[PDB]
Paper text:
Four helix bundles are also attractive for synthetic chemists because its interfaces are dominated by side chain and side chain interactions, which can be more tunable than β-strands. This study focuses on TmFtn, a naturally dimeric protein consisting of two antiparallel four helix bundles, as shown in Supplementary Fig. 1. [name] [name] (TmFtn) naturally occurs as a dimer; twelve of these dimers interact with each other in a head-to-side manner to generate 24-meric hollow protein nanocage in the presence of Ca2+ or PEG. By tuning two contiguous dimeric proteins to interact in a fully or partially side-by-side fashion through protein interface redesign, we can render the self-assembly transformation of such dimeric building blocks from the protein nanocage to filament, nanorod and nanoribbon in response to multiple external stimuli.
We made a mutant named [name] where Asn147 was replaced by aromatic phenylalanine (Phe) residue to create π–π interactions, while Glu112, Glu113, and Lys114 were replaced by three hydrophobic residues Leu, Ala, and Leu to decrease the electrostatic repulsion and increase the hydrophobic interactions between two adjacent dimers at the same time. To confirm this idea, we examined the [name] self-assembly behavior in solution concerning Ca2+ and [name] concentrations. Upon screening the concentration of Ca2+ and [name], we found that the optimal condition for the formation of filaments is [[name]] = 48.0 μM and [Ca2+] = 80.0 mM, which is close to the Ca2+ concentration (50 mM) used for the above nanocage assembly. To obtain detailed structural information on the [name] filament, we tried to crystallize this protein and eventually obtained qualified single crystals suitable for X-ray diffraction. The side view of the crystal structure revealed that [name] molecules arrange in a repeating, side-by-side fashion to form filaments. Further crystal analyses reveal that two adjacent [name] molecules have opposite orientations, forming another interface along their C and D helixes. In the structure with resolutions that permit detailed analysis of side-chain configurations, Phe147 and Leu114 side chains at the designed interface adopt suitable conformations to generate π–π stacking interactions and hydrophobic interactions, respectively, again approving our design at an atomic level. Besides the designed noncovalent interactions, Leu112 and Val119 also produce hydrophobic interactions, which is unexpected. We believe that the cooperation of these noncovalent interactions and metal coordination along the inter-building-block interfaces promotes the formation of the filaments.
Residue numbers in the entry:
A (entry chain A): 3 to 164
B (entry chain H): 2 to 164
The structure:
């Protein structure tokens, strides 16, 4: 029932979620190497969340009578020059995902595909919220300047993510 | 007491092979879901998650021994097979090779006098053999069905119940 161009768009986004999951796990490998157990735990939770979103795209594609094709996953970066540098990359990554989602929303609307528009709305909202969470983290980091006190507070807080 | 670099390399290689395995199994789910076998598809998704849990077990052991993990590119998996049996044959061939891989690391760790790593791999060795034999039992059932839709579907319901 879903148009091939819209199915292709959802399949591209599914693969982007997978890569996104992988980047975060790679961010985990960096924080774990640097001894920040709380940051690494948060990244691992984020990787798990992105995987659940990919699976949401997976099952929606099959619900609309399409088919999922899994593409190569490129090697993610594994090193950053500081906690701030890592979260800068996450924000840059996340802004791009949001843009991609917006563009699929436009493609579905031109196709007059109501279901797909509705489906993507929840992800639009989740992406906006994630972007802001990363921004608030970077604001805290920039305002702390170097003070390790704030960096350990944030390791503790994020290490509690359920 | 931190792990040697070669034992580190091999565990990290195995970590990445558990990641590909998890992705391969998910790709098999895309095939069964497209062919209309919800039960087979469900089993492959469970297996893909389990392989991720194995990858993360390697992940945390490497850091416990003061090593680090490097994630490599994940190759595109096959997305199509010529039949239910063709898919499960590739699954068995994959798991067979993983079994030899685990035993290879086990000998390398012993050679390196790394009793901690040898003891860690024991659980995986033991579980790798069990699940290689579970995949062969499935594949054997489908060959003894030959054509029979009736038995293929009963397999689909069976694997569809995996918790
Ligand atoms: Ca994402
Ligand atoms: Ca293709
Ligand atoms: Ca646009
Ligand atoms: Ca979230
Ligand atoms: Ca198993
Ligand atoms: Fe996502
Ligand atoms: Fe995201
Ligand atoms: Fe395994
Ligand atoms: Fe396996």
């Amino acid at each position: 029932v879903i148009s091939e161009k819209v199915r292709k768009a959802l399949n591209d986004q599914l693969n982007r979620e997978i890569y996104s999951s992988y980047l975060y796990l790679s961010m985990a490998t960096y924080f774990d190497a640097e001894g920040f157990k709380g940051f690494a735990h948060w990244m691992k939770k984020q990787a798990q969340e992105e995987l659940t979103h990919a699976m949401k795209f997976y099952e929606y594609i099959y619900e609309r009578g399409g088919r999922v094709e899994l593409e190569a996953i490129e090697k993610p970066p594994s090193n950053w020059n500081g906690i701030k540098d890592a979260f800068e990359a996450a924000l840059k990554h996340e802004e791009f995902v949001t843009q991609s989602i917006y563009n699929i929303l436009e493609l579905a609307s031109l196709a007059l595909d109501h279901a797909t528009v509705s489906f993507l709305k929840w992800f639009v909202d989740e992406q906006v919220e994630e972007e802001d969470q990363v921004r608030e983290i970077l604001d805290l980091l920039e305002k702390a300047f170097g003070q390790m006190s704030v960096i350990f507070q944030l390791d503790r807080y994020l290490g509690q993510r359920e």
